[PDB]
């Protein structure tokens, strides 16, 4: 039958999700583990081809196989690093992870140093609802009218987290919205100008550039009437290995922060 697999990965260890020649990718990591495990499969599909540097908590792939070992994610996880399949769902054969009705959540982790959080939250309200998001996207032939269902901003220590929820996202859309939020928070980009841009009045040559990709996390993809069974062995490995690298960066971040002069 067909299975959907919910996957986390450290995007900083890969050259993006989509398989490319001569470089390490998440899809290539997964396909190599499948090949090495001896699992024959058909109709491999992915919910989202995240860009180089972008991480995920709950991206989703789907594949069809008669090999019962696919139901134990550790068969593949033991053959991969920096990628963890931690949820599995049995799904109909016509399940397509990009086209089956779903909601996606992204989180962006923006260093808050010198940020006007209050004004950033005010700017964020402008992006709620249905707009032309062409000015806040990298064009790829898709219709640029999209709807943001939820946009929330909170503070973790040292960073601002921007959470955006919607049924579909244009290329680089979250990271380009985040950059506009930064510019709007520092008075450079007026709210009136954003409203114009969201209604299709902008200059393509001067679009706001995307925020750096390493701060973007694909938080979750929720499919209607689809639930994933969690594999505890896989989560334990995922958690063990993410805690290790969190500790290195938390320590280094705080050390670097203490070297920054107080006034700045």
Whether residue 223 is annotated as binding a ligand: the answer is no
Least distance (Å) between residue 144 CB and a copy of itself: 28
Distance CA(63)–CA(3), nearest Å, equals 6
Strand bridging mode 83-91 / 145-156:
unpaired
Residues 4-23 binding a copy of itself (CB under 8 A) are 8, 12
Q: Is 206 in the site for a copy of itself (CB under 8 A)?
A: no
- Residue 105 binding Cl ion, by CB under 5 A: no
State the residue number with the nearest CB to Mg ion: 199
Return the residue of 199, 229, 239, 251 that touches Mg ion, per CB under 5 A: 199
Q: How far is the CB of 95 from a copy of itself (least distance, A)?
A: 26
- How far is residue 184's CA from residue 213's CA, in Å, rounded to a whole number? 20
Stretch that binds a copy of itself, among 20-28, 91-99, 188-196, 208-216 (CB under 8 A): 208-216
Q: Which of 45, 34, 31 lies closest to 3, judged by CA?
A: 45
- Among candidate residues 130, 89, 66, the one with its CA nearest the CA of residue 221: 89
Q: What is the DSSP letter of 223?
A: E
Tokens encoding 167 = 């049924």
From CA 46, how far away is CA 68, in angstroms rounded? 21
Which residue of the set 10, 36, 51, 220 is catalytic? Answer: 51
Residues marked active site are found at 51
Binding-site residue numbers for substrate are 106
Residues making contact with Cl ion (CB under 5 A): 172, 174-175
């Amino acid at each position: 039958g067909r299975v959907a697999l919910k996957i986390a990965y450290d995007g900083t260890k890969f050259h993006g999700f989509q398989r490319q020649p001569n470089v390490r990718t998440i899809e290539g990591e997964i396909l190599r583990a499948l090949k090495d495990a001896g699992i024959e499969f058909e109709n491999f599909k992915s919910a989202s081809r995240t860009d180089r540097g972008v991480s995920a908590r709950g991206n989703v792939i789907a594949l069809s196989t008669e090999d019962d070992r696919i139901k134990n994610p550790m068969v593949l996880n033991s053959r991969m690093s920096d990628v963890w399949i931690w949820g599995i769902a049995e799904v109909p054969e016509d399940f397509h992870p990009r086209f089956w009705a779903n909601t996606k959540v992204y989180r962006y982790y923006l260093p808050s140093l010198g940020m006007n959080i209050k004004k950033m939250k005010e700017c964020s309200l402008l992006f709620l609802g249905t707009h032309d998001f062409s000015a806040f996207s990298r064009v790829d032939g898709r219709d640029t009218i999209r709807s943001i269902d939820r946009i929330e901003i909170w503070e973790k220590c040292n960073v601002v987290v921007v959470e955006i929820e919607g049924k579909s996202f244009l290329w680089e859309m979250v990271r380009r919205i985040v950059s506009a939020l930064v510019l709007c928070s520092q008075g450079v980009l007026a709210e009136e100008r954003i409203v114009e841009m969201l209604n299709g009045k902008f200059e393509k040559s001067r679009k706001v550039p995307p925020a750096p990709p390493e701060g973007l996390l694909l938080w979750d993809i929720k499919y209607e009437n689809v639930e994933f069974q969690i594999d505890n062995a896989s989560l334990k490995k995922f958690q063990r290995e993410i805690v290790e690298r969190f500790k290195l960066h938390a320590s280094l971040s705080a050390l670097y922060e203490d070297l920054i002069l107080n006034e700045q």
